[PDB]
């Protein structure tokens, strides 16, 4: 890790609001599409 890095690595959280319901709806749409194919 030689060399002074220019930035500190904070957590990548930028999407502060990402409802679990939307994520589990997208997972379900992708799941259905793949199963149908």
Partner 1 sequence: DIMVPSFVYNKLPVIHFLQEKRAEQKLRRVLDETYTEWTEELDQAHVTDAITRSLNI
Q: What sign for the dihedral angle of Cα 27, 19, 15, 1?
A: negative
Nearer residue to partner 1 within complex by CB, 4 or 34 = 34
Nearer residue to partner 1 within complex by CB, 2 or 33 = 33
Residue 26 interacting with partner 1 (CB under 8 A): yes
CB of 6 to partner 1, least distance (A): 24
CB of 3 to partner 1, least distance (A): 27
């Amino acid at each position: 890790i030689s060399g002074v890095s220019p930035l500190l690595y904070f957590p990548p959280t930028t999407t502060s609001t990402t409802n679990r319901e939307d994520q589990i709806n997208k997972n379900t749409n992708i799941a259905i599409q793949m199963i149908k194919r």
